Design a protein around this nucleic acid. Structure first.
Ligand code: ZN
Lengths: 221, 382, 86, 639, 130
DNA sequence: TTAGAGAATTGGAGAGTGTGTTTTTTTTTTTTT
DNA sequence: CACACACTCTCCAATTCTCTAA
């Protein structure tokens, strides 16, 4: 894959498919790795060396990136980030894992994924002002948390025992949209009462919160 | 090259998207055509079948059940998945080898006939020799067949053979050469008896429904009990004066109809039945509680025939099994000849009973054995 | 079951043309200057006859089928017979 | 996919409005051409480059901003011709199975996208400028280097004009600029239209006559000659007032139909019960009919009130017209009128002579005579429209063109009947031939009307020749006796009927004016025994089939139908041929029409034949049975 | 053809019922030509309905009243046809949004809610209530 | 030139499979009692 | 559980295509 000297020329694509295809994906990956490795603050201190070191000291599995720093240092990543946030956040997580395992080669024992979190995004929105124009875009809102579920286990990559034979169905990704139905067993074609393999299934923490407008920002009555 | 089989094509988005497939295949033919190789899948829906590219783009195969039991290939591709639910193993293996070669790439009518046919009368259509060879099901009715013919006997795959309302006087022994026969009906024919040697034929393991109603049979053979696969048995409107004494061996039996026959009393092993449905209406069972008991004299032969049934080809041993007298009565066994009769409630053996007679009429007499307390109870009843 | 057909032999010469000969014995046309209502009466009678013959079809579908049936042996033989005597 | 992405990236990038080409554009473009040449039969590289939109993003900017770099320009032109290759050429045919049809639709989608992109005037300006500075040189000065470039330029223009309109965006309303209209406007502003006129009029560059003919055909694809010839300065007020008036007419028709339906149903809700016995009407059994659909329906009772219509099986489904007509943009219509006028005055005779020479020499593709016949129809119709001058089309007025069109029409007729797997395509080719024949037959009438005794003389000569030779007379009967609604559209049936009406008009007037008895080894002739050949059941069956759409037919078409049927009835005494039950149902609709006053001729003819029928029926009741079938000589037995 | 119609299982001729209601409209005058005044009021006001008193129908023709009460689902549409035929035989170019509805009514209740029975099904009744 | 006998394709009857269902009381809390 | 709806598949035979004689 040749390095792409200009990510900015979409050449008629939209941002989502443009960053989904391999060339721009690798270019974004390398640009984010270089950003993490070489970004320095106003005093010349490498901020992300310190941040990754603190994260690995405390086993926290998550890396907060300042959007102001990203926009200042690497423009096109900040350009594509709010347009295709899921795709670029996946790529950023991969790149951050590469940098983290460069710094701490044994951190795979503690984690298998690094979550890149974005802070100080200028795209601030009021809850009353969210429209269909903001769909599938990275927004920033404010409010008071009024409800919280308990921390619940959710399927992320689920495996199913076949209802008759001993085969196990392949990894199916959970989507947040609907229940994943296994289909039919490829060994024998049965499609009966399948059951989750708890030991081979990968779970993730889930918590659904309800936020509302803060009572001092809502109008009286 | 071509393969005939049931096919099911599953687009692989469906499971993760939460959508469930049909769950069974559709009869089809697969063709490996080729300047560059294609797979053509054609069904009843499309003689002009769908192509699929396979030059470089087979994902993987599944082969755990290529022996063609609960089977498939589950051939995955970008993006579809192709399942082959029933074929023949050798041709399917050759087809899979050709598919693998085509994917390596560097080198190189679903006609059918139904299970079923019917003749409502010979003068409308005779059976002739135009039947399908592997026919599964046929009805013949109101035809003048005095005896069953090779025309239906030679059929290689019959599940159902029906001759009801024909004029059969006798039926053969070679009707039992039908391996998969599960339904045999001769309702309203002229049968004098069921075929004796037919009991130990393929029907011994295969027959699940037998109908001999409206025939002048006076008695079934004692080796009729060999038909232990049988679930449904219909014998009403006949001259039948007794069941076979070893009817208790018909452990698969669930439905029994023998209404308006000549039965005086039931066999002793009738207690071993576990029917769902029993019909014996108007059979003229005997009323009295008289005690005409057969006495033993305690001979060694009777004692041996009684006792050896509990520890059992030899024809004498088979006859002794038939004359076991229910293992020489259920208690205080002496010999297999101490025979009498008592009264039985038919809900002991069937959860649905047709009221055989009036005035309650839920009971009938049954052969019994009277060692000690049984004889005492019989004396009390008399 | 006996799924019916509007064919040349079931009904077209049995409940069809022989009855159509009799349908207009009691008709009530009034001639020149009244062609519109005469045609309305004619169409109603023809439609009623066609319905009682084959009730599965609409009237124009019945017409488009029977015009094809006009080429068949039984139909034209019955037509010539009706032209001649009975 | 990724290797194509790499080369597409290597082409360069756009910045604002300026394209910065990489130095390796030449080898990357050659690699793209190599991939396209080594395509799969599914045309995967075609689909992938269309998805990447490099034609819109790279090649058009390179073509428009680096046209001085001649090797790159030539390579880009060849690549663009390859990419704009029409889908029917890409796949050979319309695929019969879903996968190849999906690939066909993908390539067609990207072709439509290319056509959308190509409306920029800059691209056609560069193409016109390079073609102009090439054609500035003498023909003898050209070599393969320049002749092949002319071929590729004209093929690029042909490919871009050929593209079908997207089914999604063909819903444009009239008087709006479709993608084709914008493309024609781009050609107009670039001045490539004048270059096409030069190429058509040039004697030296006659080698490109077939190409230029195809360009002009695809340019005038959507237009109608008389409608186009009527365009002028004062059209905006006319069309505005016409639109308002037509809106009101449509509204009044809908209001009338709504009132009739409101009367047909009652003023009570549908679950308001009530049942009646109609004592006289026997049911399908012997019992009296029980009616449940309300008393209001028994005024116009029919037994098919509640019946589902029938599925016409696939084989019997009638052919439908392939496109609706829309009034294109007024600027484009004015430009096309001016193009057609100047082309007719300056180019048409030489171009048609050149194309006929090409067809004679047999250095043309398989069906280029279809373009020839199209050009005959369109430009002779445009000539007769507005200022008719036969000198502008005198190359076409020869009897040899009549012979050529008749031969082509008979050939297409035979091939339609035999090559059944593209019978509709052969029918369309035959339709083009029929329209060309119709325009010749109309042009001789216009020559008769015109004042010049010379053109009147030659009109008499060609009329004598055509009416003498037998095939011109027999072809109409041949077409009627094997026309099929299943295969040929109602537009074809309209054109056939109108051409037959015009032909019989001319022949009748000719024979009425003078005897001219010998015809076809000659034999005698008269028009009455010729008309008796139109007394067959099949031809009148076709005529009433066209009559069924009298509501939608043009007034001239209705006049043609009713005049032919009046000729067969009143003048040949063949009313029993037209005594039919289906025809009587059509007459019932005609008499029941609320707009029956607008069809005074049709209803009067219908009442004439109905009165004759009811006279015969009063005399003899077997006429009711005779209504039920089509007939042969029972037309005389009934009499 | 309307003259062949009879109400189902009723032996009442729809055409005869229509004619009887037409002569009722034409000739009843004495509530103290009555209903032609109501037709003119409809003509000038533009309201498509006609109120008619069942007692007037009864006093004019007992049999017509019995038919109306017993078989309203057919008789009331028959009265609609009658009144519209009269109204558009007169006033030939007046335009109405809908055909006129005849609205027969009894001045007082014929039955009460407690005494309604299955014998009264598909029968015209008048009841008082809140 | 019409139409009728044999072969192939399409319409739809029906056999088989899968899904969904049948005012009351005790306690708190803020405001008003 | 079990009795109605809802949906798919298969087979059967009725219609239309092709080739021949009246
Ligand atoms: Zn399995």
């Amino acid at each position: 894959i040749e390095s792409i000297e200009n990510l900015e020329d979409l050449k008629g694509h939209s941002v989502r498919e443009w960053v989904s295809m391999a060339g721009p994906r690798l270019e974004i990956h390398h640009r984010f790795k270089n950003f993490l490795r070489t970004h320095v603050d106003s005093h010349g201190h490498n901020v992300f060396k310190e941040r990754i070191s603190d994260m690995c000291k405390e086993n926290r599995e998550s890396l907060v990136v300042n959007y102001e720093d990203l926009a200042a240092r690497e423009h096109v990543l900040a350009y594509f980030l709010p347009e295709a946030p899921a795709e670029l956040l996946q790529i950023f997580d991969e790149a951050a894992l590469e940098v983290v395992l460069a710094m701490y080669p044994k951190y795979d024992r503690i984690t298998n994924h690094i979550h890149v979190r974005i802070s100080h995004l200028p795209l601030v929105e009021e809850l009353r002002s969210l429209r269909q124009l903001h769909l599938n875009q990275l927004i920033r809102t404010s409010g008071v948390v009024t409800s919280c579920t308990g921390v619940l286990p959710q399927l992320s990559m689920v495996k199913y025992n076949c209802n008759k034979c001993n085969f196990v169905l392949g990894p199916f990704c959970q989507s947040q949209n609907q229940e994943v139905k296994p289909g039919s067993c490829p060994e024998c074609q049965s499609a009966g009462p399948f059951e989750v393999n708890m030991e081979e299934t990968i779970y993730q923490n889930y918590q659904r919160i309800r936020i509302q407008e803060s009572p001092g920002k809502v109008a009286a009555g | 090259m071509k393969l005939h089989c049931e096919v099911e094509v599953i687009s692989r988005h469906l499971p993760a998207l939460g959508l469930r497939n049909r769950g069974k295949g559709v009869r089809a033919v697969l063709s490996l055509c080729q300047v560059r190789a294609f797979l053509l899948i054609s069904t009843l829906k499309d003689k002009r079948g769908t192509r699929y590219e396979l030059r470089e783009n087979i994902e993987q195969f599944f082969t755990k059940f290529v022996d063609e039991g609960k089977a498939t290939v589950r051939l995955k591709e970008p993006p579809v998945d192709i399942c082959l639910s029933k074929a023949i193993s050798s041709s399917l293996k050759g087809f899979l080898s050709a598919m693998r070669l085509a994917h390596r790439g560097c080198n190189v009518e679903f006609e059918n006939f139904k299970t079923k046919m019917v003749i409502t009368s010979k003068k409308d259509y005779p059976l002739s020799k135009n039947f399908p060879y592997s026919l599964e099901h046929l009805q013949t009715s109101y035809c003048g067949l005095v005896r069953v013919d090779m025309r239906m006997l030679c059929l290689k795959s019959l599940r159902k053979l029906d001759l009801s309302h024909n004029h059969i006087k006798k039926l053969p022994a070679t009707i039992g050469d039908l391996i998969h026969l599960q339904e045999l009906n001769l309702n309203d024919n002229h049968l004098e008896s069921f075929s004796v040697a037919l009991c130990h034929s393929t029907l011994q393991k295969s027959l699940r429904s037998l109908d001999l109603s409206k025939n002048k049979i006076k008695a079934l053979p004692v080796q009729f009990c060999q038909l232990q696969e049988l679930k449904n048995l219909k014998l009403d409107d006949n001259e039948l004066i007794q069941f076979p004494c070893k009817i208790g061996q018909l452990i698969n039996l669930r439905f029994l109809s023998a209404a308006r026959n000549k039965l005086p009393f039931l066999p002793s092993e009738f207690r071993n039945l576990s029917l769902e449905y029993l019909d014996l209406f108007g059979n003229t069972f005997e009323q009295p509680k008289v005690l005409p008991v057969i006495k033993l004299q305690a001979p060694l032969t009777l004692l041996e025939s009684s006792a050896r049934t509990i520890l059992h080809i030899p024809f004498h041993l088979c006859q002794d099994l038939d004359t076991a007298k229910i293992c020489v009565c259920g208690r205080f066994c002496l010999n297999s000849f101490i025979q009498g009769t008592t009264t039985m409630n038919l809900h002991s053996v069937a959860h649905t009973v047709v009221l055989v007679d009036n005035l309650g009429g839920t009971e009938a007499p049954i052969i019994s054995y009277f060692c000690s307390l049984g004889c005492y109870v019989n004396s009390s009843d008399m | 079951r006996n799924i019916p057909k509007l064919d040349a032999q079931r009904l077209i010469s049995e409940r069809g043309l022989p009855a159509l000969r009799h349908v207009f014995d009691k008709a009530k046309f009034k001639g020149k200057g009244h062609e519109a209502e005469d045609l309305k009466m004619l169409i109603r009678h023809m439609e009623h006859w066609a319905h009682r013959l084959f009730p599965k079809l609409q009237f124009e579908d019945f017409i488009d089928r029977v015009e094809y049936l006009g080429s068949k042996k039984e139909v034209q033989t019955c037509l010539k017979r009706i032209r001649l005597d009975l | 996919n990724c290797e194509l992405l790499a080369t597409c990236s290597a082409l360069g990038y756009l910045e604002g409005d300026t394209y910065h080409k990489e130095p390796d554009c030449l080898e990357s473009v050659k690699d793209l051409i190599r991939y396209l040449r080594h395509e799969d039969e599914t045309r995967d590289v075609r689909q992938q480059l269309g998805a990447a939109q490099i034609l819109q993003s790279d090649l058009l900017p390179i073509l428009t901003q680096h046209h001085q770099d001649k090797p790159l320009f030539d390579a880009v032109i060849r690549l663009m011709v390859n990419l704009t290759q029409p889908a029917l050429l890409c796949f050979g045919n319309l695929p019969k199975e879903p996968s190849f049809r999906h690939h066909f639709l993908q390539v067609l989608t990207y072709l439509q996208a290319y056509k959308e992109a190509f409306a920029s005037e800059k691209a056609f300006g560069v193409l016109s400028e390079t073609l102009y500075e090439l054609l500035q040189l003498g023909w003898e000065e050209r070599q393969e280097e320049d002749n092949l470039l002319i071929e590729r330029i004209l093929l690029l223009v042909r490919n871009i004009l050929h593209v079908p309109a997207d089914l999604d965006q063909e819903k444009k309303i009239d008087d709006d600029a479709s993608a084709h209209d914008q493309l024609l406007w781009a050609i107009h502003l670039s001045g490539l239209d004048d270059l096409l006129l030069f190429l058509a009029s040039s004697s030296a560059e006659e080698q490109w006559s077939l190409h230029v003919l195809e360009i002009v055909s695809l340019m005038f694809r959507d237009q109608n000659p008389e409608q186009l010839a009527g365009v002028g300065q004062g059209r905006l007020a006319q069309e505005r007032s016409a639109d308002f008036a037509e809106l009101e007419v449509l509204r009044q028709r809908e209001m009338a139909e709504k009132k009739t339906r409101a009367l047909q149903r009652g003023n009570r809700h549908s679950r308001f019960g009530g049942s009646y016995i109609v004592q006289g009407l026997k049911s399908i059994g012997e019992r009296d009919l029980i009616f449940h659909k309300g008393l209001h329906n028994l005024r116009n009772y029919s037994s098919d009130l509640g019946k589902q219509p029938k599925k016409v099986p696939k084989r019997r489904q009638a052919a439908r017209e392939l496109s609706i007509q829309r009034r294109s943009a007024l600027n484009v219509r004015l430009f096309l009128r001016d193009f057609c006028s100047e082309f007719l005055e300056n180019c048409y005779n030489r171009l048609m002579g050149s194309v006929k020479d090409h067809l004679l020499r047999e250095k043309a593709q398989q069906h280029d005579e279809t373009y020839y016949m199209w050009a005959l129809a369109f430009f002779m119709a445009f000539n007769r429209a507005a200022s008719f001058r036969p000198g502008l089309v005198s190359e076409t007025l020869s009897v040899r063109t009549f012979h050529f069109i008749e031969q082509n029409l008979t050939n297409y007729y035979e091939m339609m009947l035999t090559d059944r797997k593209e019978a509709a395509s052969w029918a369309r080719r035959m339709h083009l031939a029929l329209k060309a024949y119709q325009e010749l037959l109309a042009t001789v009438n216009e020559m008769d009307i015109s004042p010049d005794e010379a053109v009147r003389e030659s009109s008499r000569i060609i009329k004598n020749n055509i009416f003498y030779v037998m095939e011109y007379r027999e072809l109409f009967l041949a077409l009627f006796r094997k026309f099929d609604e299943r295969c040929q559209p109602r537009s074809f049936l309209r054109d056939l009927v109108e051409t037959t009406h015009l032909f019989l008009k001319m022949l009748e007037r000719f024979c009425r004016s003078r005897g001219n008895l010998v015809v076809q080894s000659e034999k005698e002739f008269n028009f009455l025994d010729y008309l008796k050949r139109f007394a067959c059941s099949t031809v009148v069956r076709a005529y009433v089939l066209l009559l069924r759409s009298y509501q939608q037919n043009s007034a001239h078409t209705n006049h043609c139908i009713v005049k032919m049927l009046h000729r067969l009835a009143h003048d040949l005494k063949m009313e029993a041929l037209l005594f039919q039950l289906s025809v009587f149902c059509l007459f019932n609709r005609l008499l029941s029409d609320p707009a029956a006053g607008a069809y005074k001729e049709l209803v009067t003819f219908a009442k004439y034949i109905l009165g004759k029928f009811f006279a015969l029926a009063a005399v003899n009741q077997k006429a009711f049975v005779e209504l039920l079938f089509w007939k042969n000589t029972a037309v005389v037995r009934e009499m | 053809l309307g003259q062949k119609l009879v109400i189902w299982g009723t032996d009442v001729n729809v055409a005869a019922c229509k004619e009887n209601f037409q002569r009722f409209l034409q000739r009843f005058i004495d509530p103290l030509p009555l209903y032609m005044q109501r037709l003119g009021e409809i003509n000038v006001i533009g309201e498509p309905f006609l109120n008619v008193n069942c007692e007037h129908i009864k006093s004019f023709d007992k049999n017509l009243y019995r038919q109306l009460i017993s078989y309203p689902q057919e008789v009331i549409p028959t009265f609609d046809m009658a009144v519209n035929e009269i109204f558009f035989d007169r006033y030939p170019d007046s335009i109405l949004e809908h055909q006129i509805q005849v609205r027969p009514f009894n001045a007082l209740k014929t039955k009460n809610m407690r005494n309604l029975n299955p014998e009264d099904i598909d029968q015209l009744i008048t009841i008082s209530g809140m």
